[PDB]
Design a protein around this ligand. Structure first.
Ligand SMILES: CCCCC/C=C/C/C=C/C/C=C\C/C=C\CCCC(=O)O[C@H](COC(=O)CCCCCCCCCCCCCCCCC)COP(=O)(O)O[C@@H]1[C@H](O)[C@H](O)[C@@H](O)[C@H](O)[C@H]1O
Ligand SMILES: CCCCC/C=C/C/C=C/C/C=C\C/C=C\CCCC(=O)O[C@H](COC(=O)CCCCCCCCCCCCCCCCC)COP(=O)(O)O[C@@H]1[C@H](O)[C@H](O)[C@@H](O)[C@H](O)[C@H]1O
Ligand SMILES: CCCCCCCC/C=C/CCCCCCCC(=O)O[C@H](COC(=O)CCCCCCCCCCCCCCC)COP(=O)([O-])OCC[N+](C)(C)C
Ligand SMILES: CCCCCCCC/C=C/CCCCCCCC(=O)O[C@H](COC(=O)CCCCCCCCCCCCCCC)COP(=O)([O-])OCC[N+](C)(C)C
Ligand SMILES: CCCCCCCC/C=C/CCCCCCCC(=O)O[C@H](COC(=O)CCCCCCCCCCCCCCC)COP(=O)([O-])OCC[N+](C)(C)C
Ligand SMILES: CCCCCCCC/C=C\CCCCCCCC(=O)O[C@H](COC(=O)CCCCCCCCCCCCCCC)COP(=O)([O-])OCC[N+](C)(C)C
Ligand SMILES: CCCCCCCC/C=C\CCCCCCCC(=O)O[C@H](COC(=O)CCCCCCCCCCCCCCC)COP(=O)([O-])OCC[N+](C)(C)C
Ligand SMILES: CCCCCCCC/C=C\CCCCCCCC(=O)O[C@H](COC(=O)CCCCCCCCCCCCCCC)COP(=O)([O-])OCC[N+](C)(C)C
Ligand SMILES: CCCCCCCC/C=C\CCCCCCCC(=O)O[C@H](COC(=O)CCCCCCCCCCCCCCC)COP(=O)([O-])OCC[N+](C)(C)C
Ligand SMILES: CCCCCC(=O)OC[C@H](COP(=O)(O)OC[C@H](N)C(=O)O)OC(=O)CCCCC
Ligand SMILES: CCCCCC(=O)OC[C@H](COP(=O)(O)OC[C@H](N)C(=O)O)OC(=O)CCCCC
Ligand SMILES: CCCCCC(=O)OC[C@H](COP(=O)(O)OC[C@H](N)C(=O)O)OC(=O)CCCCC
Ligand SMILES: CCCCCC(=O)OC[C@H](COP(=O)(O)OC[C@H](N)C(=O)O)OC(=O)CCCCC
Ligand SMILES: CCCCCCCCCCCCCC
Ligand SMILES: CCCCCCCCCCCCCC
Lengths: 377, 377
């Protein structure tokens, strides 16, 4: 009750501790009101509004910007408080915008969605060997895996997800057999080098952060210029690292089911990315692909932390709002891919779709024994 | 600091006191997660999306519906906690929807706004004596004035703004001289009966509610059926009524200028209503006209109590988020009228627009002496 609302406030709206420069946190919401009104007056009395399409585009951009401002004013900032809670409020505002956009798309038919996508960018309408495969997107995949390893902190989770998803991508070759590819490309380059290296780097960084002691001093008290610069740059780094062990030695059935649902939703997000790219046929270099991946990772970090907090802490009896929104976003992307994807499906074998559900369950069951037996030894 | 955040929480997120039926307040945000996903699955796989135009309409309704659900989870509930804080989160969720809508319109040109309005309702494109003037809108205008009187509790405000607006509504006859009307339409029917009668009814309600003692008991503890029914209907009535006195006997210049801004923004909302009807031609009977007045009426109730809290209590050092949004909405509607209204502007004398600014200042200055001198006697 009294603790419940406080325990949930530690998941939704984490407060900033040890505020030295009070200027950075004192609200000035009336100044924000004046700024918004004056900006709208300028953009309404000086802008040129003779072109319809550009008017619609700029209106959409302005609506997004001022929804971000409203999110700063009202929305919660998750379990994170660096560099500033306003940033995570803005990320939550983007999450809500995306969730509503996905809600809208479920009512338009395929022709209307295609027309909207062509409106977003008209160019869509027209649309040894080891060394060559490395690219910027391999860099992105590796760094995303590193961030996931940082946030999850379990080899038996990240590796299970990596192997399962790589095998699913290999199995879904029949959807797009035109492209010239081999199993080795999506086995070695991904499981061994990209995903493996990302997981290793993330794990070593998490190990460092867990045993690092945090001695955040006031930016004002520091005297030397190099010290001030170091304090400024180190702010973007986390101020603390929670001790994340998913599997208790005496874990109950509820905890195992929670971790299983976590892994299932992770694979669902990977599947949503794959099938969105497949159905709406934009290249990986297109902003609608890598921008969405970046946004999903930025959502994923606080969502992972909130899901861990809800699953472990027995005092927390409400799931955080960002984790809720991420769950809705993942499931709505799955529904969108289902609804708009019946054209490419011919003789769907869900027998493989059932297959990793047991294979994840078998592996998350060996994770228990692999630790329960190791706990004895 | 510690009190500041606590005191602002009393304006933004008022908590429910003496919770007896805990069922009505226990969150079930995972059940709300399963409800939306299952709801969209039904509307995505069973609905017929062959009509391009009706898909956009139902999509807009769905986005609005699922922004209320997000607003229930995240947005604050103002200074009000009856009949349930969720309702006042949905009412806030409409304010953010409406405020962002006005941000969009400030970039569209007059042809697109008209084209958008005809889309909402295609019928817009084509578009003794005392007893006869009474109508349903006189009922609304009276009850709107009665509702305001509850939240203000001062004759020297509700009458100053009633008198000075009715003369400003009457002075604007030159803008629309086609309609056959006389000065006595807005002199006896409104100033004396509609507005004057509404204020009197509103004031006697406050006189009752302020000296009424509140003895809210458990709904379960009540035994008789008539008592249970009486308790249920009585929930929609307020649980408490704060003693509001705008003018302190020793009021400072910051307080007088605080009330002066309240009087000015009140006219602006009255001025916005008159103009956007005149600019975008639609009659009062249209749902685009009376629908907006009902929404602004519901928005006004928490905004007045948040503005009063900010004005008086020296501990409150942040204006509530609902009072912030209503300030932006009341101004964006004025910018919208200015940008799209230059066609009717021919030889505008802002001399009368300056005129009530002094006339309100003179009357809000006599309100001081009218109370300061009465305080001595
Ligand atoms: C982007 C704009 C916002 C900036 C974001 C990042 C800042 C960078 C450098 C900072 C510059 C100075 C500004 C600092 C912002 C102050 C920190 C900040 O989030 O305040 C905002 C108000 O919003 C402005 O008052 C914001 C006014 C800032 C602009 C002032 C000058 C405008 C020209 C709210 O805080 P707060 O946690 O008390 O506010 C609420 C919060 O809205 C909800 O979590 C809950 O309702 C409640 O628990 C409580 O936490
Ligand atoms: C419309 C649905 C919402 C209902 C509105 C009016 C209710 C009528 C009869 C009620 C029936 C049972 C439902 C009761 C709703 C419980 C009350 C309610 O607002 O909870 C919501 C969650 O939202 C559901 O968990 C809502 C789940 C309700 C639906 C459950 C079954 C679905 C089928 C959250 O409140 P709360 O203040 O703890 O939560 C937050 C609040 O979101 C923000 O003000 C802040 O983040 C924070 O300060 C804190 O106050
Ligand atoms: C057609 C296809 C065919 C194949 C289909 C295959 C189907 C396969 C089968 C799948 C079935 C799996 C069933 C698992 C049930 C778990 C129940 C359980 O343990 O309860 C709880 C956990 O579970 C929860 O409820 C947690 C919150 C979830 C809600 C937010 C969603 C956001 C997700 C985003 C997640 C993040 C993802 C990040 C991504 C990187 C724990 O019990 P509790 O007592 O509530 O917890 C105690 C804690 N308190 C309450 C005391 C504080
Ligand atoms: C230029 C723009 C305006 C400038 C002034 C600004 C004022 C802004 C306005 C504010 C008032 C909001 C009400 C708008 C009036 C509705 C339009 C109308 O007359 O059409 C009726 C809708 O009848 C219904 O069935 C209503 C369904 C639920 C309500 C949805 C309304 C939109 C969101 C409101 C929810 C609250 C959100 C915030 C509230 C502020 C009848 O039409 P229909 O039977 O649907 O006929 C089908 C034709 N189409 C439309 C499908 C093609
Ligand atoms: C071209 C046309 C020509 C004609 C133009 C005519 C121009 C006419 C000229 C107008 C000039 C009037 C200027 C007066 C400024 C005085 C300010 C003042 O005293 O500060 C504060 C009040 O003022 C505020 O700042 C309050 C919050 C306002 C922001 C939210 C707006 C929402 C409105 C929604 C209104 C709802 C309406 C509902 C209606 C039914 C008080 O001082 P403070 O020290 O901050 O307060 C102490 C308390 N704390 C801080 C210690 C806690
Ligand atoms: C923010 C935290 C990281 C975000 C997740 C990784 C992003 C990612 O993989 O995008 C990547 C872009 O790479 C970037 O631009 C990200 C750069 C590193 C992250 C900053 C996208 O990579 P991908 O969509 O997995 O590429 C697969 C598509 N092909 C190569 C098969 C055609
Ligand atoms: C499943 C419906 C049952 C349900 O929500 O029970 C939940 C119980 O169960 C749980 O606590 C775990 C729920 C597992 C996650 C399910 C997310 C919804 C995905 C649907 C996918 C589509 C389904 C069809 C297609 C497959 C209900 O939650 P609760 O008991 O009211 O807990 C209250 C929530 N807090 C405040 C405690 C956070
Ligand atoms: C909710 C709180 C009350 C809302 C304010 C009153 C609304 C109002 O005046 O609308 C009224 C409708 O009346 C209603 O439908 C509301 C009835 C009262 C509801 C309580 C509209 O009245 P109005 O737009 O002021 O009418 C002026 C326009 N003519 C007569 C000149 C053509
Ligand atoms: C006016 C700009 C200066 C300003 O806002 O100073 C304010 C100071 O002073 C006030 O508090 C006065 C507020 C008066 C209301 C102005 C609303 C904006 C309307 C513009 C219309 C268009 C203008 C041009 C067309 C006429 C700024 O407030 P602050 O000092 O940052 O106080 C912080 C706010 N809380 C947290 C205390 C709430
Ligand atoms: C660009 C700024 C450079 C860095 C300037 C700098 O010194 O930042 C310090 C401030 C916070 O200063 P404190 O050390 O009191 O808060 C810290 C808190 N008590 C804790 O340790 O948790 O950072 C921000 O607000 C965010 C700034 C960035 C806004 C995007
Ligand atoms: C401009 C943005 C710069 C990037 C800002 C940045 O990295 O800081 C975000 C958080 C900071 O975490 P806190 O210090 O608030 O607490 C942490 C919390 N108590 C915990 O338990 O971990 O770190 C991550 O999530 C790092 C993962 C990658 C995130 C992308
Ligand atoms: C339809 C319900 C009929 C009325 C049924 C009824 O008995 O309501 C009681 C509940 C709350 O009951 P309490 O007296 O414990 O809370 C009140 C608090 N202790 C106080 O006094 O402030 O009211 C609602 O949630 C109303 C939601 C209505 C749905 C919006
Ligand atoms: C379905 C909706 C039914 C209508 C519900 C209704 O009337 O309740 C809303 C509030 C109730 O106020 P509280 O009891 O939360 O506290 C009051 C606060 N502490 C104070 O200081 O006043 O009353 C008004 O604003 C009445 C004005 C008219 C509002 C339209
Ligand atoms: C949480 C962070 C969200 C970041 C969103 C990234 C989207 C960027 C899109 C850029 C498009 C550029 C086209 C030229
Ligand atoms: C705060 C309460 C908001 C209520 C909004 C009222 C809008 C109703 C519009 C109904 C249109 C009906 C057209 C047939």
């Amino acid at each position: 009750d009294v603790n419940y609302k406080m325990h949930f406030r530690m998941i939704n709206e984490q407060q900033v501790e040890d505020i030295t420069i009070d200027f950075f946190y004192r609200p000035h919401t009336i100044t924000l009101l004046s700024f918004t009104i004056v900006s709208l007056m300028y953009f309404a009395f000086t802008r040129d509004d003779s072109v319809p399409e550009d008017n619609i585009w700029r209106g959409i951009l302005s609506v997004i910007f001022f929804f971000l401002i409203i999110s700063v004013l009202a929305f919660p900032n998750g379990p994170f408080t660096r560099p500033h809670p306003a940033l995570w409020r803005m990320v939550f505002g983007l999450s809500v915008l995306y969730f509503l956009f996905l809600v809208f798309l479920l009512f338009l038919n395929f022709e209307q969605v295609k027309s909207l996508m062509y409106w977003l960018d008209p160019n869509l309408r027209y649309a040894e060997r080891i060394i060559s495969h490395f690219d910027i997107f391999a860099f992105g995949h590796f760094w995303g895996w590193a961030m996931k390893a940082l946030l999850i902190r379990s080899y038996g989770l990240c590796w299970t997800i990596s192997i399962t998803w790589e095998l699913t991508e290999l199995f879904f070759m029949h959807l797009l057999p035109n492209f010239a590819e081999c199993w080795w490309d999506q086995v070695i380059l991904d499981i061994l080098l990209c995903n493996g290296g990302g997981i290793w780097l993330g794990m070593v960084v998490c190990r460092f952060l867990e045993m690092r002691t945090y001695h955040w001093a006031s930016f004002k008290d520091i005297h030397t210029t190099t010290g001030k610069i170091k304090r400024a740059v180190l702010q973007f780094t986390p101020a603390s690292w929670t001790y994340v062990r998913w599997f208790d030695p005496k874990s109950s059935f509820q905890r195992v089911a929670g971790v299983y649902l976590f892994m299932i939703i992770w694979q669902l997000t990977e599947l949503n990315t794959f099938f969105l790219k497949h159905i709406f046929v934009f290249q990986a270099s297109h902003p609608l692909s890598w921008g969405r991946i970046l946004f999903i990772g930025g959502i994923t970090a606080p969502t992972v932390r909130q899901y861990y907090a809800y699953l472990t802490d027995t005092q927390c009896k409400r799931v955080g709002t960002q984790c809720w929104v991420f769950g809705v976003i993942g499931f709505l992307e799955a529904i969108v891919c289902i609804k708009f994807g019946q054209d490419l499906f011919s003789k769907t074998q869900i027998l493989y779709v059932v297959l990793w559900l047991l294979c994840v369950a078998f592996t998350t069951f060996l994770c228990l024994y692999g630790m329960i037996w190791y706990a004895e030894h």
